Design a binder for these strands. Sequence first.
RNA 1: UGGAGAGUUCGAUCCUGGCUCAGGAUGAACGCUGGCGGCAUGCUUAACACAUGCAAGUCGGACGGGAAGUGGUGUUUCCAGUGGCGGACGGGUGAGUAACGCGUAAGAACCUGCCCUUGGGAGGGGAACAACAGCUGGAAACGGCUGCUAAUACCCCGUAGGCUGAGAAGCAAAAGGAGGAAUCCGCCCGAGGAGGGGCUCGCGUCUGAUUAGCUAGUUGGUGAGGUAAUAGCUUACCAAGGCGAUGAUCAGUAGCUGGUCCGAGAGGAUGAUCAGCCACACUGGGACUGAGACACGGCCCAGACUCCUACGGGAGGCAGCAGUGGGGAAUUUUCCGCAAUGGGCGAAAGCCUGACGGAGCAAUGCCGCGUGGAGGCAGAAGGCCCACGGGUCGUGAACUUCUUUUCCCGGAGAAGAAGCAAUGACGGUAUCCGGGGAAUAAGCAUCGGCUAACUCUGUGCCAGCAGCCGCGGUAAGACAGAGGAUGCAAGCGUUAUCCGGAAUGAUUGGGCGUAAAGCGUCUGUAGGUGGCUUUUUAAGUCCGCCGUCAAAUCCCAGGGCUCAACCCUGGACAG
Lengths: 123, 80, 102, 83
Amino acid sequence: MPTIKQLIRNTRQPIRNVTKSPALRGCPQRRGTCTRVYTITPKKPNSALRKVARVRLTSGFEITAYIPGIGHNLQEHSVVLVRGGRVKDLPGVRYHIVRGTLDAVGVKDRQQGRSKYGVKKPK
Amino acid sequence: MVKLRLKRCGRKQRAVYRIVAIDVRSRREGRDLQKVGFYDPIKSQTYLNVPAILDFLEKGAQPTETVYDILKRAEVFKEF
Amino acid sequence: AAAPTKKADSAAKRARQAEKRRVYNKSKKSEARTRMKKVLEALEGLKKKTDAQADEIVTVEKLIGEAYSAIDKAVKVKALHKNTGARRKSRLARRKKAVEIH
Amino acid sequence: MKTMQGRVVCATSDKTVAVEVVRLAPHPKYKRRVRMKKKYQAHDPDNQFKVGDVVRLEKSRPISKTKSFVALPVIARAARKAE
RNA sequence: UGGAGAGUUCGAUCCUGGCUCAGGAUGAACGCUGGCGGCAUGCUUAACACAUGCAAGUCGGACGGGAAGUGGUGUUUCCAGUGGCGGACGGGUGAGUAACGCGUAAGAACCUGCCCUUGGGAGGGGAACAACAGCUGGAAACGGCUGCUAAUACCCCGUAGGCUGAGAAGCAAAAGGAGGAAUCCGCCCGAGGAGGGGCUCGCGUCUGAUUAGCUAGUUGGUGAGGUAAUAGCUUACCAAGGCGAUGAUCAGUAGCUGGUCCGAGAGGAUGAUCAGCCACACUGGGACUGAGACACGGCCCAGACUCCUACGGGAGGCAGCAGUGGGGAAUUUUCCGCAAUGGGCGAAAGCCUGACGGAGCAAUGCCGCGUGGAGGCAGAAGGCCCACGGGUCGUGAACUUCUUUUCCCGGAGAAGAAGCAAUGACGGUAUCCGGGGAAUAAGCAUCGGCUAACUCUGUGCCAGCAGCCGCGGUAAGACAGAGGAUGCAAGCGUUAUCCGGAAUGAUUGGGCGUAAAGCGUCUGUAGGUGGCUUUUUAAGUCCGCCGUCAAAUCCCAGGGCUCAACCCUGGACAG
């Protein structure tokens, strides 16, 4: 342990803290309009065609976001809503998309996870 | 000035009613400098501390309507 | 709907009454400051300038007698009160005996 | 009223003496003694107390905004550095 | 009565070490779903700009009156006006402020409406003035002349303990009004009490020193000036100091605290709701009135906006309640009432009171209940698996008897009202009795390992999954669907955020030969520590006691709403 007399001179205290995903002033979700909807390749162990879109937030920042599930309907003028979660396979992508909200539609014919992916109840 | 009455602590249907020693320029349910005693409406619980009363009334304290009646319901304030 | 007769809640009413309470208190305070400055000019120049033969009243203590009566008449009203009205008398009574010939 | 002892460091001021009070007090979170030193501007209308004298300070009527303490007694003589 | 971890850096092992997950919590949002009740809570993002209504008025037992309404044949009562008191209470916001703002402990140089204890006095006069009336300038706002008039409007005179002063002496106050064969209230001065509000001092009060210098009334001293009061608060002069590494100044950020969340504790992160304190309220500045606010719903000036105009000139500002626009992931009825408690006024009645008491919207959270109970096959259809000899979903269902809270319908009906022609918003209230009938009421996540729970198809590094290690290139329990199972529950899941896990800043709790780590080596100031004996001091320390540590949280024991949440007594604790 650092000696008791050096603990009065220096006094150990943490930092200003860095955030994992800057979604402003402690806000859970953030709204924004999609600028460019493109397709990008993953890292070294994976090889697929993942759909990523650059979302222009309400603050003025343009960060990338991942689209979950099979099939979507996001255009160049679509008003989407982000979540805030890393994928760790695609570099730069720190956000996720909440489907079933605003302009983002839910996944068709999905029977499993209806709370996430934004799917309604089939009768 | 200072006066005697009762405040509110118990909300909704259950109005318990608090103790007293507060100024007129303050709140309905705020700061109280000294404690005394209270009464519960739908119960047989009637306190009202007698050595605290008459000791506070001698130095410019005004006895208002609500502290009265519950004063004469007990053995205090009579021709004795 | 509106009323058949005319009405307007005068906010200038509380201002006019405040100006009426001011004009009385200002005229009595400005009097107590102008009369005091007339006395301070007699204590400054050391006025032993005698001209009256009937009454040998000295001009340095004559205006101080008018100053005493000018301070206590302001203690009646809401302009000047206690402790302050005693302080205005204590400082004027200190310099009349200090700046005087023995 | 409160009484605190200390040594005079500066005397080059008109009717005012700079008294440095040393106070030893243990830390509530830790255990050891942490020394704090604050200088008080005491009143001395008789200009008797010079630099190096250890005097006790009592609370009184404020003669200024920084000055509120007066030096009434004296426990020991000059305990300063040699010239 | 309090302290469980595991996965992953290797061929592997043991260390070191970062990352990740299991937990709780959050005035939360989103996605799916959605039966109620009790209690609490609800722009945390623009202190942004605001339609409308309301949020402070009350007294004629202070007056000149009487424009309404009700009697009588002039009294209740009362529109305006003078005057008294309150608009500096309450409500809201936290922008600003790390600062003598706040918290804790002391101090002296104070003021202080209404209330209260004591003593004395309350005599005798004067000149006006709104309202009103006759004219009159203007679109309006706002007014401009002349005349009349009352009072607890005002101003003298007389008297005077107090005040000034060493003393002698000098000098200043007034209101009267009501019921009654003289009571009640109020008025003026002084000396106290109480309560409130200023002022002084010390400690603790964020981060960055790749901000180390800062400071002229700046620090202090004499004299006048000034404040309720001490004082550089102020002016002139004299001295020239004053602050700083136990870190000033500067920059960024921020209301403080009681407490709240987590944690075994310590500690860490915060301080929404409730309560104390401070500050602000269109922005900047200033003063007046008054005991007190230099004052949200007051005034004046300037500025940016909005609105009116006969453009000459004027009126406003919700960080009060409810609402609008806008921003935002997101946060509600432009409701009812004075009945109850409280505030303002009044000798009362009573009036005013979106303070508040209630209701409404919202599963936002906590708590309780309910959506059926027993019985029922040799395990029926119909699905999933199948070695097809079966098994499973399954008592699950159907089929049978039974009870029916809550929801629904009908009839009663406690208490919160003390006051006291018997006075309630809430209320078709709580709760109770009866009548139909299960009749109206469940889902969500997950199932490779940590993580509690399995296979068969389809797809097939394709599409997609993912907190981490990682899964998918034909039979992958980690993709997609189905059957089944697990967990939880009207909640579930996801995300955000703090704490825990991190003895990974360790004060309680860690380390520096090689894993990150002794500065290359000395001298040395401040600072930290310091042999042995006796006496003394006793400051630290320790014991006991007296204050304060607000209340409410938390904890212990005990009560009341059918339980609980919640509410509540005393104690404990406030280190």
